[PDB]
Each structure stands twice: as C-alpha cells, then as structure tokens.
UniProtKB/Swiss-Prot annotation, chains A, B:
The modification N-acetylalanine is found at A1. The lineage of its organism: Eukaryota, Metazoa, Chordata, Craniata, Vertebrata. This is Parkinson disease protein 7. Changing D148A: In PARK7; loss of protection against metal cytotoxicity; decreased detoxification activity on methylglyocal-adducted CoA. Changing E17N: Strongly decreases enzymatic activity. The modification Cysteine sulfinic acid (-SO2H) is found at S105. It is an enzyme of class 3 (hydrolase). It catalyses: N(omega)-(1-hydroxy-2-oxopropyl)-L-arginyl-[protein] + H2O = lactate + L-arginyl-[protein] + H(+); N(6)-(1-hydroxy-2-oxopropyl)-L-lysyl-[protein] + H2O = lactate + L-lysyl-[protein] + H(+); S-(1-hydroxy-2-oxopropyl)-L-cysteinyl-[protein] + H2O = lactate + L-cysteinyl-[protein] + H(+); N(omega)-(1-hydroxy-2-oxoethyl)-L-arginyl-[protein] + H2O = L-arginyl-[protein] + glycolate + H(+). Deglycase activity does not require glutathione as a cofactor, however, glycated glutathione constitutes a PARK7 substrate. There is a cross-link at K129 (Glycyl lysine isopeptide (Lys-Gly) (interchain with G-Cter in SUMO)). Changing E17Q: Strongly decreases enzymatic activity. The active site is at S105 (nucleophile), H125. Sumoylated on Lys-129 by PIAS2 or PIAS4; which is enhanced after ultraviolet irradiation and essential for cell-growth promoting activity and transforming activity. Undergoes cleavage of a C-terminal peptide and subsequent activation of protease activity in response to oxidative stress.
Amino acid sequence: ASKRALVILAKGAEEMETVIPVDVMRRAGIKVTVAGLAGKDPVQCSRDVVICPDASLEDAKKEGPYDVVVLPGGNLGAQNLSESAAVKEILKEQENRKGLIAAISAGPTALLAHEIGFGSKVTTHPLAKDKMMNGGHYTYSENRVEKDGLILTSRGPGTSFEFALAIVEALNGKEVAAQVKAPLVLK
Amino acid sequence: ASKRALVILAKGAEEMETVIPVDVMRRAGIKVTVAGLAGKDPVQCSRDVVICPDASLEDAKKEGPYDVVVLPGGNLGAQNLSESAAVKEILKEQENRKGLIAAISAGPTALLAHEIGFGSKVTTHPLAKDKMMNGGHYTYSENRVEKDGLILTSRGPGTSFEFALAIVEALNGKEVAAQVKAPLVLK
Ligand SMILES: [Cl-]
Ligand SMILES: [Cl-]
C-alpha cells in the first residue's frame, strides 16, 4: 500500500526545498499532497516561484494521517509554519501517532515553535542554528541529513536531494531509494 | 546592469530542473522571466508540481533580448519545446546575436530539433543521448556540465545546481557564483 506524504507550503518557502522533496517522493511512488497553509491559492515562494498547491491544509488534514509530514524551509516560510495553530495540531498529532516528521533548513525551527521532538538530535541551515538551539531543547548536528528516530532534519537547498532520499528510505526502504537515486544523476 | 534570463516552461517539464535554475539565478541578481510556452496559465510539470509562469512566452519575447535562454528538461517538456515554432524563433535569434543558450537533461534535444549549435560539444541525460546524437551533429560529453562557447548543457536533476551555477558564472562571473554557492550547503 502506498505511503503518503503531506508537504506544507507557506508563503516565503524555499521553493527548491519544496519541489525537490515533492518530485523525489513521487518518483518513489509516494502519494504526495502539497497543501497550502493559507488555503487553496497559489503560493509565492522565497525566490518568487509561484506554486499551486494540490489542496488547502484544511482539506488535506481531513485526508490524513500521513506517513510523513514535511516542512520545507526558507526563513519566512518557516516563520509562517511556526505561527500556525493548524500546523501545531498536525505536528502534535503526527508525533502522538509515532509518525515521521521531516524538516529542512529553517523548517526545523517550526518544530521548536510547536514543541515537537525535544531531546532529539537535529540539524538546520547553519544560519538557523541559534534560533533552533534557543533553550537547549535539541542537540545540534552538522550532518547534512540528521535522523533521530522519527525526527528527520536537513540543512539547505544543496542537501535537499539527500533529505528527500532519506525520507524515501525511511518510508519505502533502501532499495527503492537507490533505484530512485540513479536516474537523477547525483554525484 | 542586471543580466536577464528567459526560462521557457512547458507542460511536462522537469520541475526540479526549472526551479533550481530560476532560484539560483535570482540569488545571483539575474532578472529571470519564467515564460509559459502555452500562455499565461499554470503549467503541470512532469511530477505534477504546478508552477504559475511570470508571463506567456509571447509576451516575454517582446521584452527581450535576454542574456541567456534556459531550456529545462523532462522528456515531455522537451518535446513540447522541440515542437514549438516560437521556441525555434527565440533560439535562432539568440544564436544569431551570440547570446548564451543553456539546456538540461532532455532539454538539449530541442537544440537538435531547432538546428541550434551544431558542431558543439554537448551533454544530456544519459537516456537522451541517442536522441541528441541522431545525425552526429554534436560531439557527446559525459561531463556533468558542458560548455562549448555559447552552448551550455547539463545532465539531470542532480546536476541542476552545477548547471545553474555555470550559468551564473558565465553571466556574472566566478566570484558571484562562489558567493551564491556558499549559502546553498552544496557538498
Ligand atoms: Cl531563506
Ligand atoms: Cl523526464
């Protein structure tokens, strides 16, 4: 049975960190829902790429649960994720059901805002470290991808393929991840 | 004065190969126009990411010329590029004015279709090699990025950062490219 991913897309998201995981997960046969935080309307990303979500977050929530909830980064997108009561509820539920949560660059700082996964090892974008580490609630890692159980984090646009393939491996296994990787022409 | 890039976006384009160059070029201070081949409406990419173009190709053409014309890949997107009389004219004009043309994965096969850049060294996605090489009009390279003068080619989603940074270097220079690269957290 196909695994399912919820990608939460907010204004100011890093569009590479949104599209690379969506695309790679779809390549892996994951059913991905790109859900707009603000509603069904197009989303203006950090570098002005405009992406049309598959559904509003409100609607996508009623179609869960999901095998992974994915938080792209970009500072302004991550702040919108961090400010959202809807995101808080989705992440709390996901953590309560022992489901994977994956966040990249500034995205992990929404985990802090929502009090998710304290006591985990995490990475972030280097520039987001101090924000993430306020209070000492996580242990910091400089690995390009960090996975501490059900909290999977990564650093930036240039780690997005590694992030996405780590999600694929966690859901669908190593062999699927390797099969998906080869046609991408990664170094 | 800011350099300008035209990114031609067709149905079935590889969305990573579209978004990574747009984003990286904008990071470099390039004025990028995402132009929809079919018009102004949203474009459904190969892995179902839906991108809203900045303008129709028809409108974007009247705002040229551009310092680079960029052709994303994806087989179906590249075929739509290859079938377009509008793309033929834009590429012919660009070649005639000695402007850069950049194409990735299947994208270079639109250069073949439009008879652009014959006698150049090129790369493509490995699966697109035989199509590109029909007739022997180019010399094939397995470099991740190939640049033979004003024809700049690359291989796949996993070479898109290298492709984009090569465009940045060609337009804005090595130092800008290095400055843009560092915050991306590339390996
Ligand atoms: Cl950002
Ligand atoms: Cl493709």
